[PDB]
Write an enzyme that holds these catalytic residues in place. Structure first.
Site, mmCIF file in Angstrom:
data_model
loop_
_atom_site.group_PDB
_atom_site.id
_atom_site.type_symbol
_atom_site.label_atom_id
_atom_site.label_comp_id
_atom_site.label_asym_id
_atom_site.label_seq_id
_atom_site.Cartn_x
_atom_site.Cartn_y
_atom_site.Cartn_z
ATOM 1 N N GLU A 281 0.820 -1.207 0.000
ATOM 2 C CA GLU A 281 0.000 0.000 0.000
ATOM 3 C C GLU A 281 0.857 1.261 0.000
ATOM 4 O OE1 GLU A 281 -3.265 -0.278 -0.450
ATOM 5 O OE2 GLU A 281 -2.893 -2.442 -0.517
ATOM 6 N N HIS B 222 -14.512 -11.388 -12.117
ATOM 7 C CA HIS B 222 -14.120 -10.468 -13.178
ATOM 8 C C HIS B 222 -14.965 -10.668 -14.430
ATOM 9 C CE1 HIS B 222 -10.688 -11.019 -10.461
ATOM 10 N NE2 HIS B 222 -10.364 -9.771 -10.748
#
Ligand SMILES: *[C@@H]1O[C@H](CO)[C@@H](O)[C@H](O)[C@H]1NC(C)=O
Ligand SMILES: *[C@@H]1O[C@H](CO)[C@@H](O)[C@H](O)[C@H]1NC(C)=O
Ligand SMILES: *[C@@H]1O[C@H](CO)[C@@H](O)[C@H](O)[C@H]1NC(C)=O
Ligand SMILES: *[C@@H]1O[C@H](CO)[C@@H](O)[C@H](O)[C@H]1NC(C)=O
Ligand SMILES: *[C@@H]1O[C@H](CO)[C@@H](O)[C@H](O)[C@H]1NC(C)=O
Ligand SMILES: *[C@@H]1O[C@H](CO)[C@@H](O)[C@H](O)[C@H]1NC(C)=O
Ligand SMILES: [Zn+2]
Lengths: 195, 596
Positions: B357, B487
């Site tokens: 991150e 997806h």
């Protein structure tokens, strides 16, 4: 004491209007004391172009010009002699041989609102570059297109001003900064101001 | 007075207004994610509606300027982004039915549940129970039941909807300038107008084909080894020449093989490197985890974090009355606001996630100077690639010993390195053939090469020929297997992961060569190497201003994606696999099937 210079008023004004129409303050005939100026908050940018800060007291000036405005953090670097940039060429242009002190300190603690302080505005569309030490407050529909704007906006016709939205969560580089530019002028007339 | 001069001012105005509107949308999203309430839901919805309306208005405005009259190659990119025509070019009813199909597919996938036949005693959703069963259970019958049950529950419902979806998306692409929706998605890599650095939509197909052809030997050896171990596990259900069955791969789809690590670990005596107990015994917490990650990113040469970042970011879960999503995410709210939303715990996985991150946030800081339309990654893969390269660099035993989590008196052996490389292989190499196969099938379906009456037949034949995976129970045209994946159901681009897998290894090779590393590439730490940080920053600062080919040139010295970094990374494990499988038939035959 007889007189004091209103240095405590040019700062601590609680409102600096905007930078598209920067407040111009003229000060003369007072006792110059910079103790309060140095006793205010630590300064993000304090650059003096003409005289050393101590020798400012040695040199006597008839006319002292004070200009107060609020700009973003990264736009401070544009307020300097010989700088090219949006604010420098369209809002407030210092001369190439400017002699004065640029004092900037953060105003995020006071002038930032969560909802967005849209009071402060800056100009981002002008026909040509501004001459040094000029204030342009005329706001009519910018004619970017080769067709006549006919006084209205929309296609190829925009408004000359765009506001900053200042919120406390903003990071450094977009937080509102208070800048008070002091300008000194010397002309061949009796000054009668010293100490 | 000219097209270019007119376009410049409009782009400046749009960038300035979009900055503020995107900031209020992002702040509303952050508030809702941190603190879920009806007021926050309303605020987020209002901000999103305002942002969408602004985008539509400016997109309709920007169509006035032809792209043949712009010759800056940056204003051209900004105008292309504006004129991408996100607003539907089709009819109102057609847009409404497209949204209806998308919403129905998303709802079916999200709310899909499976129960026992004529028995409402137990009803398991996908994530809580079905994924847990697929990940942990060793029962062949239970795994087959769960796989077939999910497929029968979702694909039968989602097949006609997906057929209407492919027809509608092909119509949308033809309404725009693209050929099919596959062409639309491949256009993300298309670079035109820059001679010597151009990338074409058709070049992506050939590049991916060549890269997979290069990867094939390593994947074949990995498949042989995993097949041998699974033969040891299940005695007669796996043929020494047959393809690996689908339901035994570890997850519901076979995207990742990481769940097979426990069953197929090479050497179990020596445990893998764990630092959770050490962190507890040294009294570490999330705040100092992020502080150590900040120190690492300073040492590599990237800038320090912001005081506003430290104040506003919530790196610990408030808990109690407050409820928030715990999926780690790095937020670039804009205008200097960078934040991380991560329910960090004291784990090595959370340490690596924090590094990932913070890599995201460092990239976001790097491209902050560029305009709003260009404030992104050069392509869909570099952003997660930059996250992952830092993740791998910060997990080395050298770095752990330097930071002090491990005892410095320790020394490493062959088994530990082999085990770590095999785990990373099951994580990384395994998802490459699956991604390639899924993207190829989706592109062919979009192009209309695969007819409706042969969709699933061709799908399974190509899976058997490429990934070496065969269905347990044969499925006729009624089922729609690919629609099970999130997806595919929600229509997200999926070649991003293949591209990221190649890009991260190319970045690692380049940065390790910069950092003057001697030895195998897996044991590479770029902690105190200042040169590597600048070499990466040369790309990080660009953003989308330059083509991804030029960015890749700046980082690695090559204009095209290369898989030799992956091959060099997995060379030691490849040697181990050659040693192990010397007596095993490497490869698979299409004839064998579980059903007889
Ligand atoms: C247009 O070209 C000039 C080259 O003089 C460049 O400096 C400028 O950044 C370009 N426009 C944009 C929006 O980048
Ligand atoms: C976007 O849609 C509008 C609808 O009128 C059309 O005129 C324009 O050509 C389209 N642009 C592209 C790039 O497809
Ligand atoms: C800025 O970086 C220095 C080291 O380069 C570090 O000591 C300092 O804490 C950083 N500033 C902030 C606000 O984190
Ligand atoms: C969420 O935000 C509201 C409004 O700002 C506040 O009253 C509340 O305490 C916050 N937390 C929770 C758990 O509702
Ligand atoms: C290197 O790894 C092999 C694995 O086959 C092992 O047999 C050998 O003992 C290792 N070498 C050393 C010095 O431990
Ligand atoms: C990297 O630099 C830090 C700070 O000086 C130091 O403590 C650490 O030992 C260095 N790394 C290695 C592997 O020596
Ligand atoms: Zn990432």
């Amino acid at each position: 004491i007889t007189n004091l210079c209103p240095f405590h008023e040019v700062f601590n004004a609680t409102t600096f209007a905007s930078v598209y129409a920067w407040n111009r303050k003229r000060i003369s005939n007072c006792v110059a004391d910079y103790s309060v100026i140095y006793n205010f908050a630590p300064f993000f940018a304090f650059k003096c172009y003409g005289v050393s800060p101590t020798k400012l007291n040695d040199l006597c000036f008839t006319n002292v010009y004070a200009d107060s405005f609020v700009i973003r953090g990264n736009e401070v670097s544009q307020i300097a002699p010989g700088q090219t940039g949006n604010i420098a060429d369209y809002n407030y242009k210092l001369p190439d041989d400017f002699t004065g002190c640029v004092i900037a300190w953060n105003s995020n603690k006071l002038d930032s609102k969560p909802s967005g302080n849209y009071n402060y505005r800056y100009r981002l569309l002008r026909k040509s570059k501004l001459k040094p030490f000029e204030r342009d407050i005329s706001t009519e529909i910018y004619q970017a297109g080769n067709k006549p704007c006919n006084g209205v906006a929309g296609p190829n016709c925009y408004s000359p001003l765009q506001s900053y939205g200042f919120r406390p969560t903003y990071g450094v580089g977009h937080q509102p900064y208070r800048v008070v530019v002091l300008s000194f002028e010397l002309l061949h007339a009796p000054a009668t101001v010293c100490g | 007075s000219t097209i270019e001069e007119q376009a410049k001012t409009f782009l400046d105005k749009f960038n300035h207004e979009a900055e503020d509107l995107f900031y209020q949308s992002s702040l509303a999203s952050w508030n809702y994610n941190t603190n879920i309430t009806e007021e926050n839901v309303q605020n987020m919805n209002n901000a999103g509606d305002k942002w969408s309306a602004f985008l539509k208005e400016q997109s309709t405005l920007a169509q006035m300027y032809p792209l043949q009259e712009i010759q800056n190659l940056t204003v051209k990119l900004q105008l292309q982004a504006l004129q991408q025509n996100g607003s539907s070019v089709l009819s109102e009813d057609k847009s409404k039915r497209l949204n209806t199909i998308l919403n129905t597919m998303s709802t079916i996938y999200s709310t899909g549940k499976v129960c026992n036949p004529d028995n409402p005693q137990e009803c398991l959703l996908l994530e809580p129970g079905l994924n847990e069963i697929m990940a942990n259970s060793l029962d062949y019958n239970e795994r087959l039941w769960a796989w077939e049950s999910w497929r029968s529950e979702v694909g039968k419902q989602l097949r006609p909807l997906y057929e209407e979806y492919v027809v509608l998306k092909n119509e949308m692409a033809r309404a725009n300038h693209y050929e099919d929706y596959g062409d639309y998605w491949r256009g993300d890599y298309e670079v035109n107008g820059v001679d010597g650095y151009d990338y074409s939509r058709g070049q992506l197909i050939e590049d991916v084909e060549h890269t997979f052809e290069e990867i094939k030997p390593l994947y074949e050896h990995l498949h042989a080894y995993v097949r041998a171990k699974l033969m040891n596990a299940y005695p007669s259900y796996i043929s020494p020449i047959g393809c690996l069955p689908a339901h035994l791969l570890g997850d519901m789809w076979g995207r990742f093989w990481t769940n097979l690590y426990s069953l197929t670990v090479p050497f179990g005596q020596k445990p893998n490197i764990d630092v959770t107990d050490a962190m507890v015994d040294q009294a570490w917490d999330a705040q100092r985890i992020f502080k150590e990650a900040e120190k690492f990113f300073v040492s590599v040469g990237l800038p320090n974090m912001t005081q506003g970042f430290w104040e506003n970011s919530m790196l610990t879960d408030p808990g109690n009355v407050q409820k928030a999503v715990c999926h780690p995410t790095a937020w670039d709210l804009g205008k200097g606001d960078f934040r991380i939303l991560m329910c960090t715990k004291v784990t090595m996985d959370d340490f690596l996630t924090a590094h990932h991150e913070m890599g995201h946030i460092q990239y976001d800081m790097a491209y902050a100077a560029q305009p709003f339309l260009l404030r992104n990654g050069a392509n869909e893969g570099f952003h997660e690639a930059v996250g992952e390269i830092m993740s791998l660099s910060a997990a080395t035993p050298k770095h752990l010993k330097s930071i002090g989590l491990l005892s410095p008196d320790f020394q490493e052996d062959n088994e530990t390195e082999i085990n770590f490389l095999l785990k990373q292989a099951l994580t990384i190499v395994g998802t490459l053939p699956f991604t390639y196969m899924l993207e190829k099938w989706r592109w062919m379906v979009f192009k209309g090469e695969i007819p409706k009456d042969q969709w699933m037949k061709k799908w399974w034949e190509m899976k058997r020929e490429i990934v070496g995976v065969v269905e347990p129970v044969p499925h006729d045209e009624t089922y729609c297997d690919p629609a099970s994946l999130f997806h595919v159901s929600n229509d997200y681009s999926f070649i991003r992961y293949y591209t990221r897998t190649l890009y991260q290894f190319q970045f690692q090779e380049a940065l390790c060569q910069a950092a003057k590393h001697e030895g195998p590439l897996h044991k590479c730490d770029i902690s105190n190497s200042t040169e590597a940080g600048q070499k990466l920053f040369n790309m990080l600062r660009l953003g989308k201003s330059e083509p991804w080919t030029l960015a890749l040139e700046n980082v690695v010295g090559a204009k095209n994606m290369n898989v030799r970094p992956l091959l060099n990374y997995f060379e030691p494990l490849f040697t181990w696999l050659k040693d192990q499988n010397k007596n095993s038939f490497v490869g698979w035959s299409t004839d064998w099937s579980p059903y007889a």
